[PDB]
Design a protein around this ligand. Structure first.
Ligand code: HEM
Ligand code: HEM
Ligand SMILES: Cc1cc(N)nc(CCc2cncc(CCc3cc(C)nc(N)c3)c2)c1
Ligand SMILES: Cc1cc(N)nc(CCc2cncc(CCc3cc(C)nc(N)c3)c2)c1
Ligand SMILES: C[C@H](O)[C@H](O)[C@H]1CNc2nc(N)[nH]c(=O)c2N1
Ligand SMILES: C[C@H](O)[C@H](O)[C@H]1CNc2nc(N)[nH]c(=O)c2N1
Ligand SMILES: [Zn+2]
Lengths: 403, 406
C-alpha cells in the first residue's frame, strides 16, 4: 500500500506515503503500465476540492483550525451554493501556483519551487490587456539575463463562456515555414502555429529563427495578433569554446522558456491562461531543440564540420557532436551572462529536492522518463533513483488546442 | 475509437494500438493511483497450474497452426492426466524450444529481441549432478562464444519439483569479475560482486588480487550444498580495451569479457519453473562502456579517464563526464571490432528494436516494453526508441527474478 522506493547507487530506501493524497487517476492499471505515454486521453465535487485546498492553505501558514480558516471555509461554501463557483484570494492564488509547480512530476527544476513571482492578472478583460501583462512578465522574468521564475494568471474559466487562452505553446517560439519542397525552414514544431499567425494577417519573415507573434484570445472572440518588441526578447548567439567554425552555423536560442498553453488547477478552479517561466536546462536546447530529427536536426551538419565519420553508427559521430552542441550552449549562455543550468547540476539539485520533500511531505511525485536527461542519463544521479509518479492538486494539466 | 492503449511515436507521428496486452495473465506493480514503472523489482495449487499449462499448450498449438485439432485436444488431455496423478507435468522437447524463445520474445527489458527467433536451446533436463551442470555450462560457453562469432543460446536444467531441492547457479552471470573488499573500506575489482566473491571464498576458493579476476562457479544440485568450479581460462574470451586515437587508453589495463550470460533467472513456462536455465547473447556497447565501467558503484573510471583526457573535472559545466563516457564507449566498440568479437552499438541496437516493434505489431498486435530499460544510458534522445511510447505488461512464458539461494 506504501511503495518502497530505492536508490541503486547508494542502497538507500524511503517509502512514499504522500501518494495516499492522490485524488486523480493516472493512466496505469495493474494489467499494464502506460507511464511512458505523453498524454493519455456538480457543486459537491467542486466544494470538496475547494475545501481541501483551503485546508492546504491554512495548514501551510500554520493557522489550521483558526477563526480566519473557519470563516473562509464558510465564505467558499456560501459562494458555491449561490453561484456554482467561487474566487481565490491573492495569497491563496500565490500559494496554489507554487504548489502546482511543486506537484509537477515532469519538472527537474522543483528545488526552486518556493521562489516564484506571481502576477495576478485576473482583472483582465481584453486580449490587449493580456499583451500588456505578457510584456511585463517577460521584462521581469528576463531581468537582463538574470532570469527569475514567474507566473501570470489570467481569469479563471466560467461555465457560460469561452476561455481566456494563449494559442502559443510558449511565449517565445521560432516560426516553422513549410517550403515548396515539403522541407521545413525554421522550427518544425511550430509549423501549425506559424500558419495560424499568417492566417490572421502576420507578415512572415523567412529565416531559421523568426520570433513568432502571439495570438491572444479573450472569451468568445477571434484571437488577436501581437508582435513582441524585439527589445523584450533576449536571444543568445551560439559559439563554441574551441571550435571557431561553430559560430558560422549562425545558430542561436532565446533565453526565456515560458510555457503558455497549460492549464492551472487550484482548488477545483481552472485557469486556462497562466503562462510560467524559469530558466533553461542546457539539454533542452543543445540536445532536444537542436538535435531532435523532427526539430532543427543539426547533428549531421555539426559532425561533418567536425570531420567525423558519418558512414557508420559505430564511430559514435552522433554522440560526439551532441556533446559539443550542448557544450556550445553552456559556453554561449555563460558568455552572454544568461541563467542556464547543465544537466549534472540540475539533477544533483533534484536529488536534494527529493530529500527535502521526503522530510517535508513523505514523498515526491516524479516521472522518471522526464526527470532523466536525454544524453548521458546514467551519468546523472537521477538515473539510479527509483521514483513514484502520481497526480497531486494544485496541478498544471495539458489542455486541448483552442482551434 | 479502439478500446486498447494508443501508442505514438513522436518523431514520426505514427500511431498503433496494443491489443496484445489483453493476453496478460499477471498484474504488474502500477495502479490508477500511482505509476511504479521505474521500480527495479516491484513487490503448487493444481487448478492454478492446470490453467497456466492449458494456456501454454494453446500458445504452442497456435504457433504451429493446429489450434482445435485432435493433437491439440489430446495433448491438453495428456497434460491434465499428468497433473491429476503427480501434481506436475513435463514439456515435449519442441515445447521447451518454443517456450524458451517465447520467454525471450516476452521480456520487456531486452532491446535485443529482434533476434528472438534465433536461439539455440540446449535441453539439459537429464542433468543429475553439480559436476554435470559444470559440463553443460562449459559446452554452453564453448558454443555460444564460437571464437568471437557469438551465438545466442540457453541451457535448460531440470524443473522445480515438489519436495525436492532446486537446481541453482549461485553466480548471477556465468562470467563475472571478483570484488575484493579492502582494509580501507574501498573495493578492488567489481563492487557488484562483493557478496558472491565472499561466498566463493567461504566455499574454498583460493582468491586472486586483481581488478579482473574471473570468478568460479558455485553450482547447486537438488538438496546438496553448492560445489565450486573454476572455468578453464581458454574458455573465457576477453577483449583488452584500447582507444582508436587516444594511445594512452590501452595503458589503463581495462578489459571485458565477450559473453554476457545471465544465470540467476527463473524461466517459467506453462506453470513449470526452471530455476537453472542460463541464457546468453552478445553485448550492447553501453552495458560495458557506460554502465559497468562508469557507474559510480561499479568500476567508476570516469574521473580517471577525464584526467587523462586533460578535462576540467572541477566543474560540471565542462561536460567532462559526457566526453569521457563517449570515449570509453568508443573504446569498447573499437576493441571488440578489432578482436573480431560480436558487439552492437546503442544506435544499431535501437534501430533494430524499432524494426522488431513493427514486426511484433503485425504478428501479435503489440510488444511489451520497458521504456526506462530500452532507452540507452547514454545519448538517450539520439536513439529512435526515446520517442516511442511503450506499453509494459507481463506475458508468459517469462523470465523472472528469483531470490538469491542463500
Ligand atoms: C526555474 C528553472 C526551471 C528549470 C531548470 C526547469 C526544468 C524543466 C525541464 C528540463 C523540464 C522538462 C521539459 C521538457 O522536456 O519539455 C520541465 C518541465 C516542466 N516544468 Fe520546469 N523548470 C524550471 C522552472 C519551472 C517553473 C517556474 C514552473 C512553473 C511554475 C515549471 C513547471 C514545469 C511543468 C508544469 C513541466 C512539465 C511540462 C510538460 O509537461 O510539458 N518549471 N522543467
Ligand atoms: C542477442 C543479443 C542481445 C542483446 C544485445 C541484449 C541486450 C540486452 C540489454 C542491453 C539488456 C539490459 C540489461 C542491463 O541493463 O543490464 C537486456 C536485458 C535482458 N535480456 Fe537481452 N540481449 C540479447 C540477448 C538476449 C537473450 C538471448 C536473452 C534470453 C534468451 C535475453 C533476455 C533478456 C532478459 C530476460 C533481460 C532482462 C534482465 C533483467 O530483468 O535484469 N537477451 N538485454
Ligand atoms: C518552465 C520551464 C523551464 C524550462 N527550463 N523548461 C521548460 C520546458 C518547456 C517546454 C518546451 N517544449 C516543450 C514542452 C512540452 C511540449 C508539449 C508536449 C506534449 C506531449 N503536450 C503538450 N501540450 C506540450 C515544454 C519549462
Ligand atoms: C542475455 C543478455 C544479453 C545482453 N546483451 N545483456 C544481458 C545483461 C543482463 C544483465 C546484466 N547486468 C546486470 C543485470 C541485472 C542482474 C540483476 C539480478 C537481480 C537479482 N536483480 C536485478 N534487478 C538485476 C542483468 C543479458
Ligand atoms: C515517449 C517518451 O516518453 C517521450 O519521448 C518523452 C520521454 N522523455 C522526455 N523527457 C523530457 N524531459 N522531455 C520530453 O519531451 C520527453 N519525451
Ligand atoms: C531507477 C531505475 O529504474 C534503474 O536505475 C534502471 C533504469 N534503467 C535501466 N536500464 C537498463 N537497461 N539497465 C538498468 O540497470 C537500468 N536501471
Ligand atoms: Zn506505470
Amino acid at each position: 500500500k506504501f511503495p518502497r522506493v530505492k536508490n541503486w547507487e547508494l542502497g538507500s530506501i524511503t517509502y512514499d506515503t504522500l501518494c495516499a493524497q492522490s485524488q486523480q487517476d493516472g493512466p496505469c492499471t495493474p494489467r499494464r503500465c502506460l507511464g511512458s505515454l505523453m498524454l493519455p486521453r456538480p457543486a459537491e465535487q467542486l466544494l470538496s476540492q475547494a475545501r481541501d485546498f483551503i485546508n492546504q492553505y491554512y495548514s501551510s501558514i500554520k493557522r489550521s483550525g483558526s477563526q480566519a480558516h473557519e470563516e473562509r471555509l464558510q465564505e467558499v461554501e456560501a459562494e458555491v451554493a449561490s453561484t456554482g463557483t467561487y474566487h481565490l484570494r491573492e495569497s491563496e492564488l500565490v500559494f496554489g501556483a507554487k504548489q502546482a509547480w511543486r506537484n509537477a512530476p515532469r519538472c527537474v527544476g522543483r528545488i526552486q519551487w518556493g521562489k516564484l513571482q506571481v502576477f495576478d492578472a485576473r482583472d483582465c478583460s481584453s486580449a490587449q490587456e493580456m499583451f500588456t501583462y505578457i510584456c511585463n512578465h517577460i521584462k521581469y522574468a528576463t531581468n537582463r539575463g538574470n532570469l527569475r521564475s514567474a507566473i501570470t494568471v489570467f481569469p479563471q474559466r466560467a461555465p457560460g463562456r469561452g476561455d481566456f487562452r494563449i494559442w502559443n505553446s510558449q511565449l517565445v517560439r521560432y516560426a516553422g515555414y513549410r517550403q515548396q519542397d515539403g522541407s521545413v525552414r525554421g522550427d518544425p514544431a511550430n509549423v501549425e502555429i506559424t500558419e495560424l499567425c499568417i492566417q490572421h494577417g502576420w507578415t512572415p519573415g523567412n529565416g531559421r529563427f523568426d520570433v513568432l507573434p502571439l495570438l491572444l484570445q479573450a472569451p468568445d472572440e477571434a484571437p488577436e495578433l501581437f508582435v513582441l518588441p524585439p527589445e523584450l526578447v533576449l536571444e543568445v548567439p551560439l559559439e563554441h569554446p574551441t571550435l571557431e567554425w561553430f559560430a558560422a552555423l549562425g545558430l542561436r536560442w532565446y533565453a526565456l522558456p515560458a510555457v503558455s498553453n497549460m492549464l492551472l488547477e487550484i482548488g477545483g478552479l481552472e485557469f486556462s491562461a497562466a503562462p510560467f517561466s524559469g530558466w533553461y536546462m542546457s539539454t533542452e536546447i543543445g540536445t532536444r531543440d537542436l538535435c531532435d530529427p523532427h526539430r532543427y536536426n543539426i547533428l549531421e551538419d555539426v559532425a561533418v564540420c567536425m570531420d567525423l565519420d558519418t558512414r557508420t553508427t559505430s564511430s559514435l559521430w552522433k554522440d560526439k557532436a551532441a556533446v559539443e552542441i550542448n557544450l556550445a550552449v553552456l559556453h554561449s549562455f555563460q558568455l552572454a551572462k544568461v541563467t542556464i543550468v547543465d544537466h549534472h547540476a540540475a539533477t544533483v539539485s533534484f536529488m536534494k529536492h527529493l530529500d527535502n520533500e521526503q522530510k517535508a511531505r513523505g514523498g515526491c511525485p516524479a516521472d522518471w522518463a522526464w526527470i532523466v536527461p536525454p544524453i548521458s542519463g546514467s551519468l546523472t544521479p537521477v538515473f539510479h533513483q527509483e521514483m513514484v509518479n502520481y497526480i497531486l492538486s494544485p496541478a498544471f494539466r495539458y489542455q486541448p488546442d483552442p482551434w
